[model samples]
Target: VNSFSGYLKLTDNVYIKNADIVEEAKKVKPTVVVNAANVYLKHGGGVAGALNKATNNAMQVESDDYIATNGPLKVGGSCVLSGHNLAKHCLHVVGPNVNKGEDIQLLKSAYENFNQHEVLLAPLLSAGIFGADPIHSLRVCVDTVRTNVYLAVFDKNLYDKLVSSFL
Candidate 1:
């Protein structure tokens, strides 16, 4: 893994960081770290998986309880929960089940509907399990969301790729 830490500006308020998100959370102390989830909030893989593990399954349990009481979580919807690990708070948003070469408009919708908050954090939505392009996803976020975005990455090769693409 790339142990080095660096960030590049994507827009006026958006940034891409090559670092562990949990550690980033500890340092920057964002008001909320965005958790990329499905309608079910299943912490099966990608950012959610790592967060679930980091939170000692608290994320998954909260998600399950919320859905059980409120029914299916919808796209453009969100749930804010108390953070358990490096995060101070967690905002879980439902993202599209996207694939490569598909229209990314729905993915854009996910970011567009985010609640107004300062210093929100996020990851490369749909870039892991859903197999969307990380660079493209980041662009969509930058285009749609106006909040301060701290996009975090942990993989060394992926970090290099994102840095090259954005900077």
Candidate 2:
């Protein structure tokens, strides 16, 4: 298994890491950090799970009201929240499913929708049960981001794969 760790800089603006997003975000203090979430905007496993506690349950309360008022945000859709953590805002996006044929396109659309150019701390979306290949997902994520990005990789094995494959 790949065992690479620490950090790799892809560019002046793009960075790859083998670490937790919350820790990175705490240091970077990006205006908005993106979180992978379901259409209904519930905080479950993966990035959302980490954010769930990091945000001190503020996300759940916000999501409850936000979804109740607006309704579910399906694939390629996202919404921003007034944050309760270090980052000023949290943008929750409903990631595309692999079972869907145009998954990559939808992922692109989702990233494109993030449009703000402030420092972005983004995690590789949909790589857990959502089933996206880490390399493909990371490429799409890093390539599509318009601003500087801190790519947060939480899993040791996944981070290793990313480092070996991309570096």
Candidate 3:
């Protein structure tokens, strides 16, 4: 098992870590952070679970309304909400299935759909219960992001290995 901890900078604008993402968001005060959600806007596990807890389930509330009005969203489709904990806005997008060659393209399309902002926070999409290889997912994430990114992580070892391999 990879047991890396702490934070590492992969680029001037990209960082990887095993810290609490909400706490980091509070510090940086990014205008928006992206959530790795399913098309149904379920917050069962992974980053979605953490965000659900941190925002007092505000994201879920927003998602509910969105679903009621728009029906289920597509893989690269997105919805935005404000006043969700530390972030001024949260952009929710359904992540692709893990190990699919299309995951990177889906993530890229999702990122592109988010409105312009300098700093954006994200977790490795599809790397948790979705069963994607974290390292490969992280590489796709790092390569796709155009804005400054704070990559929140829960696994210290995986974080370390990602940093080691990328940086």
Candidate 4:
């Protein structure tokens, strides 16, 4: 009943891509520009070790310049919710189900929007999310095609597991 052909068409509909969100949120202007659509995510964005001289261990900067600094990069994020099967126990990873009569395309995009950023952050985001397993909510999501997949972390130790697992 949800097949694109049955009521919706692929070519005509606009399924939101990760790039759209990144452009709106992340830094836009810089000496360089990076195309996020082609970028693949899978590694560390920043790294550090124990420093005795450092005053604080919490190492993050908060400022307008920080926010304005743009790299025009693309990274991967929650693209899908549950995927690959129709069974009750399967994990959902991409799009949420559209309401009965709503635009499938709109419903699909709204449920799984991605994090966007400067060209530099794109690569970092992708690398950070690499290799992590995602848990899919079976009922809220429906599986669909399109190569881009959002992260699917399924398990009790999700956060810690992803950090070590991807590393």
Winner by lDDT: 2
Please list all clashing residue pairs in model 3, or write none if there are none: 2-157, 3-157, 4-156, 4-157
Report how far residue 44 has shifted in candidate 2, in Å: 1.9
Give the worst 10-residue stretch by lDDT in candidate 2: 1-10
> Per-residue CA lDDT of candidate 3, range 1-167, in tens?
12223557787556787876767776766777788878888877788888888878877888888889888878877777773766888877776766444454576666565436666777777677767677877776666776677688877788778777773
134: Cα error in model 3, Å = 1.6
Candidate 3: stretches off by over 4 Å: 1-7, 99-105
RMSD of each: 4.1, 4.8, 5.1, 17.6
lDDT per model, in order? 0.74, 0.76, 0.72, 0.21
Candidate 2: list runs displaced more than 4 Å.
1-7, 99-102
Q: How many backbone clashes does candidate 1 have?
A: 0
Q: Write the per-residue lDDT of candidate 4 for residues 39-137, one digit (tens) a residue.
A: 111111211111101213221221113224632222212321111111111111122122222233332342233212111111111112222112222
> In TM-score terms, which candidate is top?
2
Candidate 1: residue 75 lDDT (0-100): 65
Better candidate by lDDT, 2 or 3: 2
Better of 1 and 4 by lDDT: 1
Off by over 4 Å in 4: 1-66, 70-107, 110-145, 148-151, 154-167
Model 1 C-alpha lDDT per residue in residues 1-167, reported as the tens digit of each score = 22224667778877787777767766766678888787788888877888888878988898889889988777656777777775678888776666534445678877865547667767776667767788788778878888777788778799788778764
TM-scores vs. true structure, each candidate: 0.84, 0.85, 0.82, 0.17
Q: Per-residue error at 64 for model 2, in Å?
A: 0.9
TM-score of 3: 0.82
